[PDB]
């Protein structure tokens, strides 16, 4: 499908297998002052939820990861 | 924490030990007369991604499940 991409959050077209879009907010040792580290794009699966995240969003819809 | 709750989406403090809130949405047959079934609450572990799901948001912050 198509999903949004990180930095700029624009559209990009997945390859076969990347049927799912995601938005992932994760925390470094400096989550509290910097903020979480965001990363969106095309995944093939929904990444299992690491304790360090402020949140995961996994959606099958184009550009749904926003 | 206090997470948003399904039928009505009023905040409710997770039973001590449940810190992550989630928002789920899948379609059923009336997925065109109403839209997807939306279920939101408190959990222990973020739910397993499930193919037949329109979306699944797992966040750890108050009433974020929205």
Per DSSP, which regions of chain A are E strands? 2-5, 10-13, 20-26, 37-43, 53-59
Domain count, chain B: 1
Helix (H, G, I), strand (E, B) or coil at A13: strand
CATH code for the domain of A54: 2.10.60.10
Cβ–Cβ < 8 Å for B58, A25: no
Asked how this structure was determined, the answer is X-ray
* The two structure tokens encoding residue B18: 């449940």
Q: How does B21-43 read in b/e, with b if 16+ C-beta sit within 10 Å?
A: bbbbbbeeeeeeeeeeebebbbb
Contacts of A60 in chain B (CB under 8 A): 51, 53-55
Q: At how many Å resolution was this determined?
A: 2.3
Q: Residues A62, B3, B65, CA angle at the centre, nearest 5°?
A: 10
Whether B60 and A59 lie within 8 Å, measured CB to CB: no
Place of tokens 């470094």: A28
Closest C-alpha to B4, from A27, B34, B29, B12: B12
Domain that holds residue B5: 1-66
Is the minimum CB–CB distance between B38 and chain A shorter than 8 Å?
no
Helix (H, G, I), strand (E, B) or coil at A54: strand
Contacts of B20 in chain A (CB under 8 A): 49
B47: left (phi over 0), alpha (psi -120 to 50) or beta: beta
């Amino acid at each position: 499908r198509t999903c949004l991409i990180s930095p700029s959050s624009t559209p990009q077209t997945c390859p076969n297998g990347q049927d799912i879009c995601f938005l992932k907010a994760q925390c470094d040792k400096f989550c509290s002052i910097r903020g979480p580290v965001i990363e969106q794009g095309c995944v093939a699966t929904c990444p299992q939820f690491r304790s360090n995240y402020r949140s995961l969003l996994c959606c099958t819809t184009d550009n749904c990861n926003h």
